[PDB]
Amino acid sequence: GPNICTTRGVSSCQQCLAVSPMCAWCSDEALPLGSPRCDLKENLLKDNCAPESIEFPVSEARVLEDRPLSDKGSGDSSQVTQVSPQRIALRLRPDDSKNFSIQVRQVEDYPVDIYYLMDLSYSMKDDLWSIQNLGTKLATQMRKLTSNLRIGFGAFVDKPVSPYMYISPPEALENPCYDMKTTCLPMFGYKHVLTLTDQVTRFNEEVKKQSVSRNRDAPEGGFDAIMQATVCDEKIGWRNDASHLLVFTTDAKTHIALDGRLAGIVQPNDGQCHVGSDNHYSASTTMDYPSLGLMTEKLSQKNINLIFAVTENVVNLYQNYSELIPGTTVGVLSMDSSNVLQLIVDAYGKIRSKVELEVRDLPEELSLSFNATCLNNEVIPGLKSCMGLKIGDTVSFSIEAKVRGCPQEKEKSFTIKPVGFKDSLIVQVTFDCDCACQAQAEPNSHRCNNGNGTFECGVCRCGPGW
Amino acid sequence: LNLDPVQLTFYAGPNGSQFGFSLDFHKDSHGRVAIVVGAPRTLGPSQEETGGVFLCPWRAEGGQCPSLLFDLRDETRNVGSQTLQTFKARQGLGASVVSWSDVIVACAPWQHWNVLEKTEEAEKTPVGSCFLAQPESGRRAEYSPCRGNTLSRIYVENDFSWDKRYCEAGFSSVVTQAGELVLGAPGGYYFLGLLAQAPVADIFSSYRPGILLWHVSSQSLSFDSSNPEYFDGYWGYSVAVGEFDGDLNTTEYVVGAPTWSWTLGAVEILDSYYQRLHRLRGEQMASYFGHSVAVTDVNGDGRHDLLVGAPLYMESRADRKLAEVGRVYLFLQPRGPHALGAPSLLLTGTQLYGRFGSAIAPLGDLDRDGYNDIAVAAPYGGPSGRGQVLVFLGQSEGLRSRPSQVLDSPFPTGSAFGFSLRGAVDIDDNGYPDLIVGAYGANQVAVYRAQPVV
Ligand SMILES: *[C@@H]1O[C@H](CO)[C@@H](O[C@@H]2O[C@H](CO)[C@@H](O[C@@H]3O[C@H](CO[C@H]4O[C@H](CO)[C@@H](O)[C@H](O)[C@@H]4O)[C@@H](O)[C@H](O[C@H]4O[C@H](CO)[C@@H](O)[C@H](O)[C@@H]4O)[C@@H]3O)[C@H](O)[C@H]2NC(C)=O)[C@H](O)[C@H]1NC(C)=O
Ligand SMILES: N=C(N)c1ccc(C(=O)NCCC(=O)N[C@@H](CC(=O)O)C(=O)N[C@@H](Cc2ccccc2)C(=O)O)cc1
Ligand SMILES: *[C@@H]1O[C@H](CO)[C@@H](O[C@@H]2O[C@H](CO)[C@@H](O)[C@H](O)[C@H]2NC(C)=O)[C@H](O)[C@H]1NC(C)=O
Ligand SMILES: *[C@@H]1O[C@H](CO)[C@@H](O)[C@H](O)[C@H]1NC(C)=O
Ligand SMILES: [Ca+2]
Ligand SMILES: [Ca+2]
Ligand SMILES: [Ca+2]
Ligand SMILES: [Ca+2]
Ligand SMILES: [Ca+2]
Ligand SMILES: [Mg+2]
């Protein structure tokens, strides 16, 4: 019987397929005048349409790259696969939809970078003595989880300028603790100490030579240090294929953007590296503190997982900042940093206990829908993020793409990538709106009103200009 | 709406002086409007930055301006077996300017101060200082309410209470219609923030050159606190005045504290005795709620309304992602004795890192429809990030949710176009209030004249 393919009364093969994904087109010459040429593929063969003259694209989805998920991130030159498939070929006809799956694995024994960024203001005087063997102790604990560990160290205080800095007497510049009975370092903003290295005993020995300084106001300029430790790739030494952990420890409040105006500093933070060969932040006295949004941009850009390891008296503060900087973790630090070790191991586990998918460069006309499979084969519709995972676990997502009409460009591509992951699924889309019989059309055909038209796919169309 | 963005006027100052960091209109004894401009990094005598003030006559062509000269020499006085010291190097003179009557008040929030007694000292700290001038007569005066002669040891023994050594008085400023200078000092009381009030007349009559430490009996400073909510709150980052209690004989103070309560931010309305009347709390941490405050009646009910800017507010967007754009809050004053409720309107920026809300200038009645209007700056907004000033018109229900006019920066990138604003004054005497915009990054001021409505 009649259906939407015929009742619509189309004019060409292109308009026929645009009606519904089920319609088809017969481009045969020997076809009755009353019989329509835009009907179901079952009705066309029923009316003796030549099979080769049948245009009926089918929405499909075939894989192109389907490497197996690696069992061990160890070894290799980062030839580790943690997303499968890595690439697929999608084909959609107007207003149709096709589905496909993706698998993600929190690979076991994956390299890790841990940069220790420590407050060395006077308030942290007794904290330095509790991490003198942290490098070797931390090696012993991470050895259970990864065979490629690198650790580094940096320190900060605040912008070395009045009123943050003591500027009188002249002796106070060389020794801020001059009015007391002790010596402390001259004040410094942020200084890189140790590049990420696998020689863990370099951490211990570099720590044992560190000492605290002293400034005036309680909030410390540790956000300057978070920025530089993030955007100075080559100096800190982050590895391309490794988990990046930035451990930020302090016992006090922090300065934020627009605070610098109390020192005469108005220039916004540019988010660029300014750590020279002296390993000191040279824009400390001329550039304002960074903003939470700018910090989030560069952290997400360099795949850095920030860890606030702060004391009980400011957990609520940094727990509220952590919510304004997604992907950030918080842990409670004892008053002497004696538990910083277990704090890190717990944070690294909490970091790799989640898998959240992210879409990039999705065309306007495409809409996606997700169904998650976390834990034991439990489907969770309308969800694209798992939680409560462990190292070695594996999850999978079912995805359906729904195209609206037909776009102009017939080939586009977008990416599906988990947050913080290196590998990703690339979806190569191809919109099959046209008919193969259009590539063999007859412009100015004798069959079409004395050449006033064009003959394609077995019908006469009005030529250009009409 | 009817600001002319085609034919502008440009005043300019020395290169690298931050000319236009602060500005204000100034009428002489004859009502002739001029423009006072602050240049906090102008060079002094020893070729070292000390700041400077300029008084620009009105000329449709613009051009250069004469300096308003102040003393830039460091001072020293040996008295009372002590040694008083002022240090004007990098003091930032012109970091804030304001005009009242035929008097200009230019302030150096980072002028340093120290006291020496044998081997002890009070510590060399930024107490701040303001310079007052009557240009027509040449009279000069100073006001540094946070200078003290207490030694370092005493503050430690008293646990750093009532420590005004880091006031930075002059950070912000305002003058009541009665003639009372109100200074914001975000570093007072060990970075709690304090206010300092005093009549201009008493400042002048009680000042003599070389004294350095003198009494102004009629002054009135705010109070220290032990509440950690006020710690590092920078109470006095911005200041404004208005009428919010219904008593026309009393003047109320509006104070911004953009880091109040662990960087939550707050704005407080107070009486002239610093007794708190209301408190608006920030909506988001680190947004710097209170960076800028403005007082003007927008809905034409005679009751001043309050505007607050949070330039670093991060708007929520799709996929659980935030975007720093800035935001401005409108609070309409209720009829009679009642508390200011929730915000009547939320204006949010669009350009990332644009800092919409960094400055808010009352414009008066721009289009002359009976409702006062405002201007909001986005010093790094606009599609180019060069800067933008948006105009919002008043209405019976508050403000319009969309701008009536947008002024794009005529300067290059990094000009900070809109960092400072000032309106509600008719400089060409055409019957329409005009707007002056500062761009300290380009060392220039731009004057937009209001024309009849097209
Ligand atoms: C980190 O972020 C958290 C979460 O935002 C902050 O904790 C909030 O702090 C605010 C202000 O201190 C609290 O707001 C107050 O709520 C009280 C009632 O809360 C009830 O309901 C919550 C629901 O979870 C319970 O947890 C709670 O125990 C109560 O049962 C009101 O009484 C308060 O109103 C009073 O004070 C205000 C002025 O603040 C007046 O205007 C009112 O008229 C009234 O007098 C107020 O609304 C909020 O409850 C807190 N939430 C939580 C979950 O604790 C932290 O402060 C923040 N920390 C840092 C360091 O930034
Ligand atoms: N009501 C007031 N007028 C008032 C309000 C707040 C303060 C304040 O924050 N004081 C904290 C100053 C501070 O913490 N300085 C740091 C500088 C640094 O970290 O290097 C420090 O040394 N803190 C040490 C020593 C210390 C210094 C001054 C006061 C107390 C303790 C600590 O907390 O142990 C002071 C006064
Ligand atoms: C996600 O789950 C939903 C519901 O579990 C799926 O929708 C169902 O699909 C079947 C098979 O096509 C239909 O018969 C049902 O009517 C659908 N139910 C709905 C929509 O509520 C959906 O296909 C899944 N998506 C993906 C990408 O796997
Ligand atoms: C789409 O879902 C069906 C189950 O209804 C499944 O059999 C099929 O494999 C899915 N498509 C792809 C490309 O995996
Ligand atoms: Ca500090
Ligand atoms: Ca009053
Ligand atoms: Ca009103
Ligand atoms: Ca108006
Ligand atoms: Ca005018
Ligand atoms: Mg400290």
Numbering used by the authors:
A (entry chain B): 1 to 466
B (entry chain A): 1 to 454
From the publication, what sentences describe this entry?
Integrins are heterodimeric adhesion receptors that transmit outside-in as well as inside-out signals across the cell membrane. Ligands of αI-less integrins such as αIIbβ3 bind to a groove located in the interface between the α- and β-subunits. When activated, the ectodomain of αIIbβ3 undergoes large-scale structural reshaping to an extended conformation with an open headpiece and binds with high affinity to the two distal ends of a fibrinogen dimer, causing platelets to form tight aggregates. Within fibrinogen, αIIbβ3 binds not to RGD, but to a 400HHLGGAKQAGDV411 sequence at the C terminus of the γ subunit.
Some αIIbβ3 antagonists have two carboxyl groups, such as Ro-435054 (22). To test whether the second carboxyl group would orient similarly to the α-carboxyl group of KQAGDV and AGDV, we soaked Ro-435054 into crystals. However, crystals were preserved when we soaked them with 1 mm Ro-435054 for 2 h in Mg2+/Ca2+. The compound bound to both αIIbβ3 molecules in the asymmetric unit and induced shape-shifting to states 6 and 3. Density for Ro-435054 was well defined; however, electron densities for ADMIDAS Ca2+ ions in both molecules were very weak, and ADMIDAS Ca2+ ions were therefore omitted during refinement. Ro-435054 is a 4-residue peptidomimetic, with an N-terminal amidinobenzoyl, a β-alanine, an l-Asp, and a C-terminal l-Phe. One of the nitrogens in its N-terminal benzamidine overlaps with the ϵ-amino group of the Lys side chain of KQAGDV. Most importantly, the side chain carboxyl of the Asp residue and the α-carboxyl groups of the Phe residue of Ro-435054 align very well with those of the Asp and Val residues of γC dodecapeptide and AGDV. Most interestingly, the C-terminal Phe residue of Ro-435054 adopts an identical orientation to the Val of KQAGDV and AGDV and thus may be considered a fibrinogen-mimetic. The dicarboxylate αIIbβ3 antagonist Ro-435054 binds the high-affinity state of αIIbβ3 ∼100-fold better (KD = 6 nm) than the low-affinity state (KD = 580 nm).
